[PDB]
Design a protein around this ligand. Sequence first.
Ligand SMILES: COc1cc2nc(N3CCN(C(=O)[C@H]4CCCO4)CC3)nc(N)c2cc1OC
Length: 409
Amino acid sequence: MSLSNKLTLDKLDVKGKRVVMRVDFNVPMKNNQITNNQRIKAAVPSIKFCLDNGAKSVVLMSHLGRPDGVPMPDKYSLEPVAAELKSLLGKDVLFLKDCVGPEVENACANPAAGTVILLENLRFHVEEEGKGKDASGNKVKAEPAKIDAFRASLSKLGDVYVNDAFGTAHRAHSSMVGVNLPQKAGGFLMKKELNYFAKALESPERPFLAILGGAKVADKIQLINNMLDKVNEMIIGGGMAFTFLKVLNNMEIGTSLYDEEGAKIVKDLMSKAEKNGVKITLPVDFVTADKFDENAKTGQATVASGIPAGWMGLDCGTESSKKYAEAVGRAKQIVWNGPVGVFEWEAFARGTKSLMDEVVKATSRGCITIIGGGDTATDKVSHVSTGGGASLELLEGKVLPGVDALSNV
Ligand SMILES: COc1cc2nc(N3CCN(C(=O)[C@H]4CCCO4)CC3)nc(N)c2cc1OC
């Protein structure tokens, strides 16, 4: 699973060379204001490395949002990201208003030593994804010749290629799998992410506990299945749990999330767990709400009492947190993916906060702790992933096209 077999940046000579580098700068924004810069900071070590080892230039390219192959510079520009990178680098970032074409190529052909360039959003061109939508919202497909010419343009921007875009590594997009340079190395973020997930999934310290939260079950059946073959314990929490509780324990769940497709395979999953000796910890109590709202009336219920009158469970309860904390207590390795409550809303955040507390504690006493960033919870853990969709693929046992496209050693 690791990058052990692939060319990496640490064994790539960059002195005197232009580095074209694909990063995941697809950060959360609001009114063209960045609201979480973790993805930017995470790329800094590879960038600083290139600079400190004499790279003539570092050309950065990324997508942002899903403009679907039409320029939306007033909604999805990376310009704000150039300013943020400058502050983090403590160095000028030259921002270009496009990512391919004669002007961008001229700009990148032979820059003054040490220049850092950020290109404009790759997805302003339908050739990045290979498909998209026209200006009228009709789906469109990119044309092979134009995809080729798009790729050839990007490839002209450097002498060697580094992909540090772990967050995008599940996407076989042009900048990810289509750069035609002989040396294609993974950066430090790509390497670090893959080392942590490879350790956890191939060679974990045991007991190995997976904490799987989130909402829907149907789309996580493969994930759960694969994890049941690797873990010793598994917490199944968040909206997902109600499907298991209704099916396995006859629980009355009110209007709580229920996955009819998921319910059909629940017993199969649990049979697999029991055969494998995996201890499953589901919630035993809940914070309830009379409506799906931040300011709903709240209540408390257990599995035994049921969730009442059209009410829904939006967080686990105090006793669930204890069960979770015991499982965390027993873990030497933890992978946490998906939230266990609706923690954006403070009345339903307690479950998540207690659990993060337990996971931070475990780290302090030597537990290897891997959490997702963003959807899972709100640097006192071993590894916070920058890739949610991408890590999900890894957890399901799938291949990362961004990783396969790299040169072997
Ligand atoms: C217990 O943890 C969770 C519960 C979640 N529940 C929900 N829903 C969303 C769908 N729901 C509704 O539409 C309401 C409105 C009347 C029917 O119930 C209620 C349940 N959604 C979610 N996104 C939930 C997420 C959760 O944790 C991550």
